[PDB]
Design a protein around this ligand. Sequence first.
Ligand SMILES: [Mg+2]
Ligand SMILES: [Mg+2]
Ligand SMILES: [Mg+2]
Ligand SMILES: [Mg+2]
Ligand SMILES: [Mg+2]
Ligand SMILES: [Mg+2]
Ligand SMILES: [Mg+2]
Ligand SMILES: [Mg+2]
Ligand SMILES: [Mg+2]
Ligand SMILES: [Mg+2]
Ligand SMILES: [Mg+2]
Ligand SMILES: [Mg+2]
Ligand SMILES: [Mg+2]
Ligand SMILES: [Mg+2]
Ligand SMILES: [Mg+2]
Ligand SMILES: [Mg+2]
Ligand SMILES: [Mg+2]
Ligand SMILES: [Mg+2]
Ligand SMILES: [Mg+2]
Ligand SMILES: [Mg+2]
Ligand SMILES: [Mg+2]
Ligand SMILES: [Mg+2]
Ligand SMILES: [Mg+2]
Ligand SMILES: [Mg+2]
Ligand SMILES: [Mg+2]
Ligand SMILES: [Mg+2]
Lengths: 337, 185, 201, 125
Amino acid sequence: SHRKFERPRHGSLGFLPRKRCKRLRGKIRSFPKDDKEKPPHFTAFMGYKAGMTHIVREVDKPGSKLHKKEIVEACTIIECAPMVVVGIVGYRETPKGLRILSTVWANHVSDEFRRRYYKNWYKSEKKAFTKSLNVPEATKNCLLKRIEKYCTVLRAICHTQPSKTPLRMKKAHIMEVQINGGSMKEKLEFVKEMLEKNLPVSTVFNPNEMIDVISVTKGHGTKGVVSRYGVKRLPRKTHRGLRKVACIGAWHPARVQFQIPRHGQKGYFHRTERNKKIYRIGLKTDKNSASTDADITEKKITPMGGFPHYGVVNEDFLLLKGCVAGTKKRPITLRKN
Amino acid sequence: KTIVSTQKVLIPEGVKVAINARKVTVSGKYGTLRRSFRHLPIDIRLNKLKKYIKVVMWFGVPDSLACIRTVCTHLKNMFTGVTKKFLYKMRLVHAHFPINSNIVDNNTRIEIRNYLGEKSVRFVKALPGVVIEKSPNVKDEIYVSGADIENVSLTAALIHQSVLCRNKDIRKFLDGIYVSEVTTV
Amino acid sequence: MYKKEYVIDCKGHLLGRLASLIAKELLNGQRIVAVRCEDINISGSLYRNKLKYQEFLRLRTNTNPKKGPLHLREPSKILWRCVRGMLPHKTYKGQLALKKLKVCVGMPYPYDKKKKYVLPSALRAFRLKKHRRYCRLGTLSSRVGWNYDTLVKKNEVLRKQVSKAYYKKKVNNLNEKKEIKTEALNLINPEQRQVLENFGY
Amino acid sequence: AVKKVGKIIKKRTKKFTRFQSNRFMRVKPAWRKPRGIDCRVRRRYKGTNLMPSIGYGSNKKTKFLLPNNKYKYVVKNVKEMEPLIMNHTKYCVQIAHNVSSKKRKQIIERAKQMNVSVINAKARL
RNA sequence: UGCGAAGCUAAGUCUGUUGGAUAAUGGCUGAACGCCUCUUAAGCCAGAAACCAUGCUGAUUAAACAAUACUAUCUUUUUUGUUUGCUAAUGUAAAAGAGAAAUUAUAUAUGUACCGGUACAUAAAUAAUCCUAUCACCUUUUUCGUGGCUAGCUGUGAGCUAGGCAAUAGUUCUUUAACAACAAAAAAGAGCACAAACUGUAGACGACUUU
RNA sequence: CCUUCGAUGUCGGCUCUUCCUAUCAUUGGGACGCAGAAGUCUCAAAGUGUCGGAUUGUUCACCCGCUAAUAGGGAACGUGAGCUGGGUUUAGACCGUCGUGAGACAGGUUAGUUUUACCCUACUGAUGAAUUUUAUUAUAUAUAUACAUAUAGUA
RNA sequence: AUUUCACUCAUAUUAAAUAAAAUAACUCCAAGUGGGCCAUUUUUGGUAAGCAGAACUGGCGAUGAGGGAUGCUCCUAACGCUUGGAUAAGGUGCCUAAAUAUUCGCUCAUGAGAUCCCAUAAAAGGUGUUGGUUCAUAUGAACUAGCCCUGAAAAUGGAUGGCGCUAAAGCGGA
RNA sequence: CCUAUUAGCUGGUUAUUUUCGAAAGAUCUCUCAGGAUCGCUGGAGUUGAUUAAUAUAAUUUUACCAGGUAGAGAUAAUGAU
RNA sequence: UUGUUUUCACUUUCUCCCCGCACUAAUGUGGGGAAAACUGGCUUUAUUUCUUCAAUUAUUUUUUUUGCUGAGGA
Ligand SMILES: [Mg+2]
Ligand SMILES: [Mg+2]
Ligand SMILES: [Mg+2]
Ligand SMILES: [Mg+2]
Ligand SMILES: [Mg+2]
Ligand SMILES: [Mg+2]
Ligand SMILES: [Mg+2]
Ligand SMILES: [Mg+2]
Ligand SMILES: [Mg+2]
Ligand SMILES: [Mg+2]
Ligand SMILES: [Mg+2]
Ligand SMILES: [Mg+2]
Ligand SMILES: [Mg+2]
Ligand SMILES: [Mg+2]
Ligand SMILES: [Mg+2]
Ligand SMILES: [Mg+2]
Ligand SMILES: [Mg+2]
Ligand SMILES: [Mg+2]
Ligand SMILES: [Mg+2]
Ligand SMILES: [Mg+2]
Ligand SMILES: [Mg+2]
Ligand SMILES: [Mg+2]
Ligand SMILES: [Mg+2]
Ligand SMILES: [Mg+2]
Ligand SMILES: [Mg+2]
Ligand SMILES: [Mg+2]
C-alpha cells in the first residue's frame, strides 16, 4: 500500500557512498572552463582553516529591512602561507579522458616537498629528487616545446609551506592547479616566470571574489541512522531500540535498497561548498591586518589566547564569509568559480 | 512505380548556378546561396548552354514525385533570392502600448521593447545573412530581407514568436508583429 | 577469418548487422579490431534511436545500481555491448571470443597503419533504401552524454591529412615501379616476356 | 564409448555409478536402481546418470574373455589345475587370494609345465 | 545546587548552477493535390520543474590506467637445455606468406591544375587484385645500392659470367621449422615500507593523520 | 479453491524506502459559454511537493485550520526476529436477545505473556591481497615501429 | 420339429473387400486401482474463470527424445547399446547446427512487427500508404480490405527468449 | 499393569536384470479420505491354431433396417409473434 | 451451342515528311502523318558439328569423385 502521509526522503542520494574521503587534502574535481580571451592565471589555492571570528559589515541591499544598518556575520579564517610552484604538468585530451604527456620540475625542490614522497623521512637517506634535480636544461626545454605543441591543458604542481604555520606536520601538501588563460604558449611562459618562486593569495584572488571551498568534513566515526540522516526517533515504547529505521524496505524487492538510511561513517567526507565570499585578504607584512577604517587600532587577526586548537596566524590569510567544511587545522582548497 | 518523372526549372538571366552531387550553389547580385539535397534520390542535371535545370527521378511512388516537385520549388526560390532579395514586410500592431522596435548590430538583432508594457527586452537575432530594416514609407512595419527564402521567413517567424502574448484571450488582445506581405524588391 | 588480426573500419556500417558479422568471426577464433566506431550507423531515425537508448538507460537495478545494466555510452563501448549480446559470453569460449574483440573510437597507434577492411554485407549503402531514416551512432552517443565527439572529429581530421600525405608518397612510389616495369620488360627475354603478357603482368 | 581391442567389443568402459553417489557419502557407488517418483534417472532425462540395461551386454561369443582372449579360471590347488591341461589356450589361471607363498610357487611351476597363463604370477614375489 | 570552559550540538549560522538536444505546442520553407497544407512527405526553427551533459559524491563500481620520484641489478650476444616440498628449467584459444595503412560518396567518388567553383584525367565484379616465395652451398669476372671506419677496406642485399658441386634413408603416419618464458654455462656493461614510540585534523578494530 | 493446515504471525497506526500516473499543485502549452480576474476541459510532464489537529482501534469517514496543493494508487491489501497491541480471534467477567439447558451471537463491554539473528545473502560503512593470452588512443630520433612495448617495490 | 438315408451347393482364391486374423478362446488364482487431470470437437450451469459438470477421441498420469527460449498435457515422435545415412516438427543474421539464399509484393511506427496451444487487445476513426469495387464528369465522389497509425493507462528494471533487424533478421507468398 | 489396546488416518517399508503391465468407470455400502464386487493387469493352465485357413476384427463394401440431433419450417399442428 | 464466313485492331525502324523548332530522361523528343519489309510472321525447297535438338514424364544404361560398414567362418 501507499505510504499514508507523503514526506521527502531523508538523506541526499547525491552524496552517496557516505564513506571516508581517501585523503585530508580535498581534491578539486574540476577546474573552471577555459576562456582563452583572458590573461593566464591560477584557479586554485590551498590554505589551512584556523578558526572563525565574527565581523561587522555595513549592508548595501536597497530594499532590505537590513539596508543601511551594520550587521554581524560569521567568517572563517584560512591561513594562506604562499604556495610554492614546483612543476608544470601537460595534459592532452583523448577519447579516454585527459592523459599526461610529462611533468617538468624546478631545479630546486624544497625539503618539505620531498617529505611528501616519504612515509619515514627520519629513517630515509632522502634520495628523492636527487637525480632529477641534476638533469640538463635542454631536456626540460624540449619537454616544454612538446607541451606547447600538443597539450591542451596546463597544471602547476604547487605545494604548501606548512613549516610556516603552527601545524605539526613538516610534510608539504602537493596539489595540481589548472592554469586558465589565452594561448598554451602564453600559459607556459607564465609558468616559467613563476616556476621556483612563490604564489601569495593576492596573485590568485581579490577582495569580494566569490570562491568555492573544497575540504574534507569533520569526522564522527560510525554514527547512527538518526544522526547520519536525520531519521525520526521511534517512540519510547519501542522494544529493541528507538534510534533506528523501523522498516528498511518492502518485502518485494527482496533486497535492502541503496536508498535506505543505515548506521555507518559520518563526517570526513569530501565536500565542495560554493559561493563563499572573500571579505578580506590579509598580509603577513601588516600589523594592522584585523584593523579597519572604523576600528583604527593595531590588531593582528589572531584572537587573544590564539585560535583555539590551531595556533597563531602570522601569515597572509583569507577572511571568507560564513563557514567551511572540516576542522581547525584542515587543508582547504579555494577555487575560482 | 513511375519509371521516369521529371521537372524543368528555368534559371533566370544573371545567375551563376553550379550543382554537383545535389549540392546546389547559386550566385548572383545578392548573395551566394548553397543548399544540399543529398537526402532524396535525384539526378538533378544542369544545362549551362541553354537555360533550365532538369530534376529527374527514376522509379519511386508518389512520395518521390512530391519530393522532386519540392526540390524544384526550392531551386526556384533560391534563384529568385539571388536575383532579387525576398522582402517579408512585418507590420507590428498594438492596442495600447506602442512597441519599440530597435534594430542593432548591423541590422541583425532586433530588440523589441514595451510589448504590452512590460519594461523588459525581447532579443531576436536574425539567421546567417538576413537584414532587418525598419520602415521608410509607413510608420509601424519592419522589412526582413536577404536572398535565402528559408532564412528570412524563419527570422520573421522567430520575431513573431518573440512577441506573441502568453496567458490571455488572444482573440481580444490582437497585439503583436505579423507578416503582412511576402514580396521581392 | 584466417588472418591474424582484421581491422574493421566501422564507418558506414549498420550497427547490428556489423555486430553479427563480427560475432561469428570472433566465435570461430579471430581477433577483430573494430576501428572508427563513432561513424557506425543505426537504421532508425535519430530520435527513435535516442528513445530506445533512453529506455535502455531507464532499466537499472532498483535495489543497487552499481551492479545491473551498465549503460556504456561511448560508441565503441555500445558496439562492444552489441557484439556481446550475440555471443555466449557466460561460457569460457564466449568470454575468450569477447576478449578477442577490441574496439576503438577514431583510429590510433597501430590501426592507422594496418589495412582497414569493410563488411559489405553490413554497409548502410547496400542495406537501407535511400528514402529511409538512419542515424550516425556518434551523434546518438553525444545526445546521450558521451561528450568526446568534437575532439574525436578533430583527431580524425588531423589523421586524414597525414593519411593524404602518405598516400601521395605511395602513389609516387607506385608510378616509379610502373615506370621501372615498363623499362625492364624490354630487358628480359622474349618468350618469358610474352608469357608474362599473356597472364596479365 | 565403445572400446574395441581386436574382436573384443566392450560397449561401456565406464561403470554405472549409483545416482547421487557423488553427493552423499552414505550412498555408495554400487548401482542401485532408483525407484521413486520424480527420480529423473528413472525417467531418463538428458544429462543424468545412465541406467544399466541389457542392451549394453557383450557378444555371447567373447563375453567373459579377458583382454587375453582367455576365460579366467580361479585356482586354489594343484588338483584343480588339471582340468585345464586340455584347455591351456582357452583358459588362464588366477591363483586364489588366500593361497600361501610356497603353494603359490608350486602352482606357478605347474602352470609353466602346462603352458597355461597365470594372470597373477607376481603375488608375493 | 550554582556557574561552567573545551568538545560535541539545533531550536543557532552559512551555501545550494547553465549549457546541449528534445517532448507538448506554435511556426518556417514546401510538395503530394496547377491552389492549400507545420511534414497527416523530404527539409528546417523556437520550445518544458522532463531528458542528457555541466557541476557535485564514490570510483578494489575499471581485477582499470597514466605520469612523476626513488630504488633492487639490467641490456645485448653466444652455447646447451626445460625428454627436506622443491633447490636446473615450459608454456601457449592458436605460425606455416597468419603479406597488404589514402580518403570519400553510395542518384557517384578521387586526384591533378587554377579561382566550395571550373577544366582535365582516374576507379567503377574495387583482395575475381597486387605484393612476396624456390635461382641451394661453392671457385671464377665483375656491376650497382645500403650500413660501419680513416678515394679505399670490411659486412649485408640484388644481378650477370664460369665450373659441376649435395641431396639418395627403401610407400605417407606433425613438414619436430612459430612465438614467448625461463635454467645453467661462459663472454660484455652498472634503498624503501611495515613495526615501535609520538600524534588526533582520525578512529569500534583496521585504516587515516602526523612526528 | 491452484498454492500453503509437520504454521507464510492474521486489522490499524507509527516508522522507512521505492515505484505507478489514471496530474491535486508547481513548468511549459492548446480550448472555452477565455474581456480582466477567477475557473473549467485538455496535451507533454511523475522533476518537486501533497501538512497540522479534534472524534473513531480503525481502513474509511467527518469537521477545524493552514496551504501552491492538501491527487489517487502499488510494492505478500509494503513494512510485528522494526515497534505498538487499541481492534479481531483463547482462557476471567458483565449485559442484551436466543436456547429447557450446557451454551450461542458474523450483538455490545472490560481485563488479558508479542520469543530467537551469532548463519547466508542484501544493504551500510571498514580493511584488503592478487590480477602476462593480460593490457595499450601511442611512444622513439620529418622517417620508423603492434614481427612493438609493459621489469617489480615503495610513494 | 427331430432322425436316417439320398441326390449336390463357390473353395485353393478361399459364397464381398482387407487383415504381423489363433499374439485366439476358455478356466483358474491373485495384484494394483476405484482422489484423476488436460487438448481438439460437441456441450450444461455461470458475467466469466487456469471455475463447476458431461459426451466422442486422444493424451498426461506411468514418458523420456527433437522442437514450442522457458513449460506434466501443444507439434514431431514414443526410448535396448552403437556406427553411418536420410528425414520429421521446426528452423537457417548472431546467440544456434543451417540462407545475411533466391523471388515477388506490402510495411517506417515520437512506445513497429515477428509464427498453433501462448501468455491479450476492441468498438470507432485516419486527405498514412497499398491495391481494388461501384459511380459520375483526369479530376470529383462514395465505398472496400491489406499493412501501418490512433484508440492503447499500473505500480522492482525488462523483455518478438536476448542482441539486434527496416534493399529485414518484419508481415504474405513462391 | 490389562497393552505391543484400537487407528478406514500420517510417515517409513532394505539387492540386480529381464519380461508383461494397469486404474483413477461402474453397482452396493451411516457411503463420499474406506470397503466389497465388476472392469482393466499379471501369472498358471488347458483346449485351440500352427493347413497364408476357419474362428475372429473399435475396418470397409453390398443388402437391409432403426433414428428425429444439426439443419429446415412458421401462409403444416402446438406454443409464441 | 459449336464449327465457319467477313469487319479493323495489332509489327518494326539507326527510314521519310509536317508542326513544336532542340521542345526530350535519352546520342534525341511530344503530337500528326507517311514509307518499307532490313525486323517479325507465314508459305516453300533442301540442310543440322554455323547454331539448335528444350522441358516434363515414361522406359533404359552408365559414369566422376567419394564417406561409413566388414557380421560370419558353412
Ligand atoms: Mg485569465
Ligand atoms: Mg509423477
Ligand atoms: Mg548550565
Ligand atoms: Mg502524403
Ligand atoms: Mg516470514
Ligand atoms: Mg499522462
Ligand atoms: Mg487539472
Ligand atoms: Mg491488492
Ligand atoms: Mg519482517
Ligand atoms: Mg513480534
Ligand atoms: Mg502489522
Ligand atoms: Mg488488546
Ligand atoms: Mg474472553
Ligand atoms: Mg498417481
Ligand atoms: Mg508423451
Ligand atoms: Mg513461446
Ligand atoms: Mg544417427
Ligand atoms: Mg540433411
Ligand atoms: Mg551458424
Ligand atoms: Mg532468426
Ligand atoms: Mg501402539
Ligand atoms: Mg491422503
Ligand atoms: Mg431427443
Ligand atoms: Mg435447430
Ligand atoms: Mg522478310
Ligand atoms: Mg570377419
